[PDB]
Amino acid sequence: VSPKEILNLTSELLQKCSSPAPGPGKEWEEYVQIRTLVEKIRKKQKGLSVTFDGKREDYFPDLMKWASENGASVEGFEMVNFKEEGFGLRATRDIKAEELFLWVPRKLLMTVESAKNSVLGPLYSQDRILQAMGNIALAFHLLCERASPNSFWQPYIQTLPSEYDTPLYFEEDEVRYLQSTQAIHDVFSQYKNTARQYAYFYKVIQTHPHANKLPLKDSFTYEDYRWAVSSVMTRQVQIPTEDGSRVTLALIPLWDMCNHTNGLITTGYNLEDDRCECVALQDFRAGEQIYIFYGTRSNAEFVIHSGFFFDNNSHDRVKIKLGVSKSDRLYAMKAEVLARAGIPTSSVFALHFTEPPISAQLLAFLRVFCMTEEELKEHLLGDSAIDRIFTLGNSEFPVSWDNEVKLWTFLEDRASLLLKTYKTTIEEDKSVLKNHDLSVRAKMAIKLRLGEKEILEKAVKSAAVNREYYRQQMEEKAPLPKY
Amino acid sequence: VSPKEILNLTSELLQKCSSPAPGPGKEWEEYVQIRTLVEKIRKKQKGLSVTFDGKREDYFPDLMKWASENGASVEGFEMVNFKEEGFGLRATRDIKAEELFLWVPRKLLMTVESAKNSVLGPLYSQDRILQAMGNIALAFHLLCERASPNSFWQPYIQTLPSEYDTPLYFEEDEVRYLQSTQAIHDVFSQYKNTARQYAYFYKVIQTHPHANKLPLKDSFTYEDYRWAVSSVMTRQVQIPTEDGSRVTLALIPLWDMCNHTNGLITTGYNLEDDRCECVALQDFRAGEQIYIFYGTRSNAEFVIHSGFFFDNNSHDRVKIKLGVSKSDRLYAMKAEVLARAGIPTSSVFALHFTEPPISAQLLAFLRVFCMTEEELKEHLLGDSAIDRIFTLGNSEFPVSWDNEVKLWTFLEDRASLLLKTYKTTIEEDKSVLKNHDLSVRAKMAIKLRLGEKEILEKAVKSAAVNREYYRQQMEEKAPLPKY
Amino acid sequence: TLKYPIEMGIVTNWDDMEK
Amino acid sequence: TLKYPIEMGIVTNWDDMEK
Ligand SMILES: C[S@@+](CC[C@H](N)C(=O)[O-])C[C@H]1O[C@@H](n2cnc3c(N)ncnc32)[C@H](O)[C@@H]1O
Ligand SMILES: C[S@@+](CC[C@H](N)C(=O)[O-])C[C@H]1O[C@@H](n2cnc3c(N)ncnc32)[C@H](O)[C@@H]1O
Ligand code: NA
């Protein structure tokens, strides 16, 4: 393989991935075209530029010794390769809920700030993408230190995974299960973003003099970049800067071996002591895996950015795009009520799987969306208008019984329509999962498309129930709640 | 690390592992001593000598092309990474039970014969260990072809696993779960044999002139040897030679991607067409994993030699050692009856978990073991003695009700005694599996020790049932069956 | 509660052409 | 049945010092 052929291929890849979106109906074809080009490049390269002679668990002792010398907690847990979640931490003694059992001083972290002071510093000061996007900066920080045998962070880097289950690693037929879903567009964007960035930085490293000292000047493969961005997207956090005035992105060694379970955030940054601190989410008996709660993300975010699907995610949600139509004769009034309420005229809202399917913001939007002219004037004029605006997001204080019946009818119809745009039904998806033997990645894709439809089906039932509740209040001429 | 340092360590290792057996109470200490030496060597070496740039699945298309070019079946299935079993074959069309769906011609196989005709030929012709042990010769055949870039079998070797779950890969504390079991002695032997062999052959390769042209002279690590013997242990088969006169050991590409399920052997060698042939064990719909039945092995054999534990193994068994003592005054008569029955006076028998807990041979032994002098004479003298020997293994024709009561009493007591020699109880093992989060390898060890005890407990219960049944037949003076 | 809660794998924008 | 049944992973003796 010649370096001129790879440079030609990355130039073609850069041009392909910088073109504008060819319209949603050609996105699958574009995705496959980009995949074909990436795989041609990947097959002509040697995988990860830097690989380590030992097994991943061979390096966990060095991680512990390094973390201990720099003031981190290293007693009371051990690293175990769990089947369901991969490597994680297991308690070696009983740990009580709310016990401060894990702490990591700032010196151990990799941050945008440590990226700036490293060998990447010169190129960082020149490139507009690196300056604007701390996540990409972290990824290149990871790669440069990985390729630096004397790096301070070598004990952390040598214990990182070598592969991930983000969609960047899926086969084409595994992504194909997601055709017609909401999620697949984010899969497309992730793949095109990553390919464009790889080609862009491949050329930048060649052309910039400030990149002459980087080990990436000698070797920078697609596999390198896919590994680095996947390492960052599955593990990065936001912390305050040392001054406490701004926030920065970081990687937190040792702590980021914890796997996810449902609960509440119990990890916080301690600025007085300058360290990350983790208290136990629940009691952990000796021999039990130590879990944390990653955050209130949807399963689409867990799959695309974290590389796993979480069963019983109580924060799961899908998107729903809604806006007041400029052809509506009440557009001006509706837009103004929405503006006074702090809500855009058009937006992407969320439908949740939990007991309230819609947020206060979505409820307020739908109320205005279905308001009559008389109702709109009562939200625009007079000494009670701001009071009425103030309660627009509150389920307890409807505008009118008729307004509620109209809005839940609309939501029922729209969620029903959204269900009819999927290639498969919920029952078909359950049959696929029961009757076929599938890879982990394939199961993630199918569970994701199943989960989108299950949220919409629950919204249909929820809206139908609410429509009947408010139709009852209307027929019984119940007094409206006030104040 | 210098070459002289490794040579001194393998010299120490060869001596340590060539020492005689230290006695059963010393075997755990010897095991940890040998692990200490091996791990010190392994930490001074660079893992696998040859690694490939792509991932494992990147090479499956080359395996298929190479297999197709040489006459193997390559249509109707695809390779999938299954969570439970690792990579396996999945049907891409409906395959009917007994359909010949897979076949592999001899030219694709790796065999002792192909080992003799390779670059290993010279060393093979003068080394007494290679000539005597085809399994070890296959392991070096694998390693030599692995380090030969133009090898005919490169598409097969590049698709093999890089790591296994045989006990050679367990942590010390994962093997520690097996203390006090029957299985752990074979774990000890496997570890000592492998260490001795690596140390022996490392010195051979560095000095013997017939090894001057082997790629292994440039690099031969402990990881290399552990990988090679584990590849052979988990996958090797016995086939006839091309002339049908004798048997040989072999590796069968493509077919050995099938994973195991309960059933019957459906793979045979077709000597007329000179190919391996596999017919479908059951119906496989498109999208279902294709399984074969590996053979009627115990879970101890599956763990130690195949690297997995098989739930609901219908052929699972434990050993029970029994012999007529020379202190018995009836020893001579008992020994003669057993001899005429073709049963040794002392042997290792099996207890099984499924419907018939003892074999015909063990039942026959236990009957003779418990016979009175008069019963023995009826099996040695007169015109019905041979007929009585013939039926000795048949549960339908007891010697006498009293003989049955005594033998089932004995078996009940002996299996209860064996149960008490374990460090844990069945209930304690179930609690560990329920209340601890364990690695796959740790779970294999605990399920193996639980399984030994469950077979003994079922033997205790079956013997108690049988003792009561025959005691009822006796106390009611029931007539003994005849013929 | 926590002054600086820490979210593992917090979702960031990777679209270098958008914002 | 099968004239030459093939057993996957057939158990062999690895004790070189035995014989
Ligand atoms: C912050 S890391 C946790 C440590 C990781 N398991 C490792 O081996 O390095 C996040 C990764 O762990 C895995 N993970 C975390 N929680 C999980 C869960 N509940 N189920 C499956 N995988 C999980 C996913 O692979 C995810 O990308
Ligand atoms: C002959 S190979 C089969 C192909 C293998 N899975 C691979 O990826 O190369 C035997 C190995 O497959 C795995 N295996 C086969 N059957 C299994 C089963 N029923 N459950 C778990 N693992 C199994 C074990 O790792 C075993 O050593
Ligand atoms: Na022991």
Three-state SS annotation for chain A: CCHHHHHHHHHHHHHHHHCCCCCHHHHHHHHHHHHHHHHHHHHCCCCCCCCCCCCHHHHHHHHHHHHHHCCCCCCCEEEEEECCCEEEEEECCCECCCCEEEEEEHHHCEEHHHHHCCCCHHHHHHCHHHHHCHHHHHHHHHHHHHCCCCCCCHHHHCCCCCCCCCHHHCCHHHHHCCCCCCHHHHHHHHHHHHHHHHHHHHHHHHHCHHHCCCHHHCCCCHHHHHHHHHHHHHHCEEEECCCCCCEEEEECCCHHHCEECCCCCCEEEECCCCEEEEECCCCECCCCEEEECCCCCCHHHHHHHHCCCCCCCCCCEEEEEEECCCCCCCHHHHHHHHHHHCCCCEEEEEEECCCCCCCHHHHHHHHHHCCCHHHHHHCCCCCCHHHHHHCCCCCCCCCCHHHHHHHHHHHHHHHHHHHCCCCCCHHHHHHHHHHCCCCHHHHHHHHHHHHHHHHHHHHHHHHHHHHHHHHHHHHCCCCCCCC
Strand partners, A346: A323
- Closest ligand 2 atom number to CA of residue B306: 27
Q: Which helix (H) or strand (E) holds B96?
A: none
Distance A296 CA to ligand 1 centre (A): 16
- Tokens read off for A26: 């050609």
Sheet holding A259-260, edge to edge: A77-82, A86-91, A289-292, A259-260
DSSP-derived secondary structure letter, B209: G
Distance B44 CA to ligand 1 centre (A): 31
Distance CA(A119)–CA(C12), nearest Å, equals 24
3-state secondary structure B12-57: HHHHHHHCCCCCHHHHHHHHHHHHHHHHHHHHCCCCCCCCCCCCHH
- A194, A258, A269 ranked by CB distance to C4: nearest: A269
- Tokens read off for A475: 């027929």
- Closest ligand 2 atom number to CA of residue B257: 4
Burial of A192 from C-beta contacts in 10 A (0-12 / 13-18 / 19+): buried
- Contacts (Cβ under 8 Å, ≥6 apart) of B173: none
Q: Judged by CB atoms within 8 Å, which residues 181-200 of A form the interface with C?
A: 189-190, 193-194, 196-197, 200
Ligand 2 pocket, residue B253 CB under 6 Å: no
Domain B1-309 annotated CATH 3.90.330.10: no
Cα–Cα distances in angstroms (integers) from residue B69 to residues A166, A277, B62, B72, B105, in the given order: 35, 60, 10, 8, 11
Choosing from B55, B235, B260 the residue with most ligand 2 atoms within 8 A of its CB, the one to mutate for a pocket test is B260
Ligand 1 pocket, residue A259 CB under 6 Å: yes
Nearest ligand for residue B444 CA: 2
Phi, psi of A288 (to 5 degrees): -100, 145
Tell how strand A86-91 and strand B275-279 pair up. Answer: unpaired
Distance CA(B417)–CA(B109), nearest Å, equals 48
Domain A317-475 annotated CATH 3.90.1420.10: yes
Is A64 annotated in some ligand binding site? no
- Tokens read off for A275: 């360290």
- Closest ligand 1 atom number to CA of residue A260: 16
Class of domain A3-52+106-306: alpha beta
Domain boundaries, given as residue ranges, for chain A: 3-52+106-306, 317-475
3-state SS, residue C1: coil
Residue C5 · residue A265 · CB < 8 Å: yes
Distance CA(B241)–CA(B227), nearest Å, equals 26
Distance CA(A327)–CA(A17), nearest Å, equals 36
Nearest ligand for residue A162 CA: 1
Please list every residue in chain B whose beta carbon sits closer than 8 Å to the beta carbon of residue A435: 285, 287-288
Residue C5: closest C-alpha in chain A? A268
3-state SS, residue B249: strand
Distance CA(B340)–CA(B89), nearest Å, equals 50
Q: Residue A280: which of A295, A265, A297, A294 has the closest Cα?
A: A265
Tell me the technique behind this structure.
Answer: X-ray
Distance CA(B360)–CA(B391), nearest Å, equals 9
Residue A240 · residue A271 · CB < 8 Å: yes
Residue A43: closest C-alpha in chain B? B54
Phi, psi of B462 (to 5 degrees): -65, -40
Determine whether the interchain pair A135/C12 forms a contact, defined as Cβ–Cβ distance below 8 Å: yes
Residue with tokens 């290679």: B130
Residue A403 · residue A411 · CB < 8 Å: no
Please list every residue in chain A whose beta carbon sits closer than 8 Å to the beta carbon of residue B289: 437
Residue with tokens 């078909």: A428
- Contacts (Cβ under 8 Å, ≥6 apart) of B233: B135, B166, B305, B306, B307, D9, D12, D14
- Tokens read off for B53: 């740039």
Determine whether the interchain pair A240/C6 forms a contact, defined as Cβ–Cβ distance below 8 Å: no
Q: Is the dihedral of CA A243, A249, A254, A258 positive or negative?
A: positive
- C2, C3, C7 ranked by CB distance to A295: nearest: C7
Residue with tokens 């006169």: B245
Sheet holding B289-292, edge to edge: B77-82, B86-91, B289-292, B259-260
Identity at A256, one-letter amino acid code: D
Cα–Cα distances in angstroms (integers) from residue C4 to residues A241, A290, B347, B365, in the given order: 11, 21, 70, 75
Distance of CA B53 to the CA centre of its chain: 33
Burial of A135 from C-beta contacts in 10 A (0-12 / 13-18 / 19+): middle
Burial B33-72 (b: 16+ CB within 10 A, else e): ebbebbeebbeebebbbeebeeebebbbeebbebbeeebb
Please list every residue in chain C whose beta carbon sits closer than 8 Å to the beta carbon of residue A267: 2, 5-6, 8
Is A436 in the B-facing interface, judged by CB distances under 8 Å?
yes
Distance CA(A137)–CA(A124), nearest Å, equals 8
- A133, A136, A265 ranked by CB distance to C7: nearest: A265
Residue with tokens 């104040």: A483
- Contacts (Cβ under 8 Å, ≥6 apart) of B45: A53, B1, B6, B221, B222, B223
Determine whether the interchain pair D9/B234 forms a contact, defined as Cβ–Cβ distance below 8 Å: yes
Residue B72 · residue B108 · CB < 8 Å: yes
Q: What angle do CA B261, B265, B270 make, to 5 degrees?
A: 135
Choosing from A60, A260, A309 the residue with most ligand 1 atoms within 8 A of its CB, the one to mutate for a pocket test is A260
Residue with tokens 């019983």: A312
CB atoms inside a 10 Å sphere around CB B99: 14
Distance CA(B66)–CA(B156), nearest Å, equals 9
Distance CA(B88)–CA(A434), nearest Å, equals 18
| Helices and strands in chain C, H and E counts | 0, 0
DSSP-derived secondary structure letter, B357: -
- Radius of gyration for the alpha carbons in chain C, expressed in angstroms and rounded: 13
Strand partners, A276: A104, A269
Report the length, in residues, of chain A: 483
Is B229 in the D-facing interface, judged by CB distances under 8 Å?
yes
Distance CA(B254)–CA(B266), nearest Å, equals 16
Q: Residue A316: which of A464, A462, A421, A183 has the closest Cα?
A: A183
Phi, psi of B258 (to 5 degrees): -75, 140
- Tokens read off for A208: 């910039």
Distance A446 CA to ligand 1 centre (A): 19
Q: Residue B393: which of B354, B414, B355, B366 has the closest Cα?
A: B366
Strand partners, B374: none
Largest Cα separation within chain B, whole Å, is 82
- Tokens read off for B274: 């000179």
Residue B411 · residue B358 · CB < 8 Å: yes
Residue B418 · residue B426 · CB < 8 Å: no
Q: Residue A15: which of A192, A249, A216, A234 has the closest Cα?
A: A192
- Tokens read off for B354: 């499924």
Q: Which helix (H) or strand (E) holds B267?
A: strand B267-270
Nearest ligand for residue B262 CA: 2
Determine whether the interchain pair C14/A190 forms a contact, defined as Cβ–Cβ distance below 8 Å: yes
- Closest ligand 2 atom number to CA of residue B261: 19
- Tokens read off for A127: 């490139």
Distance CA(A228)–CA(A310), nearest Å, equals 23
Residue A165 · residue A153 · CB < 8 Å: no
Residue with tokens 């459906």: B266
Please list every residue in chain A whose beta carbon sits closer than 8 Å to the beta carbon of residue B432: 287
Q: Residue B177: which of B442, B461, B477, B457 has the closest Cα?
A: B442
Choosing from B60, B77, B84, B85 the residue with most ligand 2 atoms within 8 A of its CB, the one to mutate for a pocket test is B85
- Contacts (Cβ under 8 Å, ≥6 apart) of B139: B225, B228, B229, B231, B232
- Tokens read off for A92: 């070696």
Q: Where are the alpha helices (DSSP H) in B158-258?
A: 172-176, 184-207, 222-235
Identity at B337, one-letter amino acid code: V
CA contacts within 13 A on the Cβ side of A300: 21
- Tokens read off for A400: 């009118």
Q: Whose CA is nearest to atom 4 of ligand 1?
A: A257
Distance CA(B366)–CA(B375), nearest Å, equals 13
Q: Residue B345: which of B317, B368, B329, B363 has the closest Cα?
A: B368
Nearest ligand for residue D7 CA: 2
Cα–Cα distances in angstroms (integers) from residue A229 to residues A259, B244, C2, in the given order: 19, 57, 28
Distance CA(B360)–CA(B440), nearest Å, equals 36
Report the length, in residues, of chain B: 483
Residue A176 · residue A80 · CB < 8 Å: no
Is A87 annotated in some ligand binding site? yes
Q: Residue B316: which of B305, B301, B331 has the closest Cα?
A: B301
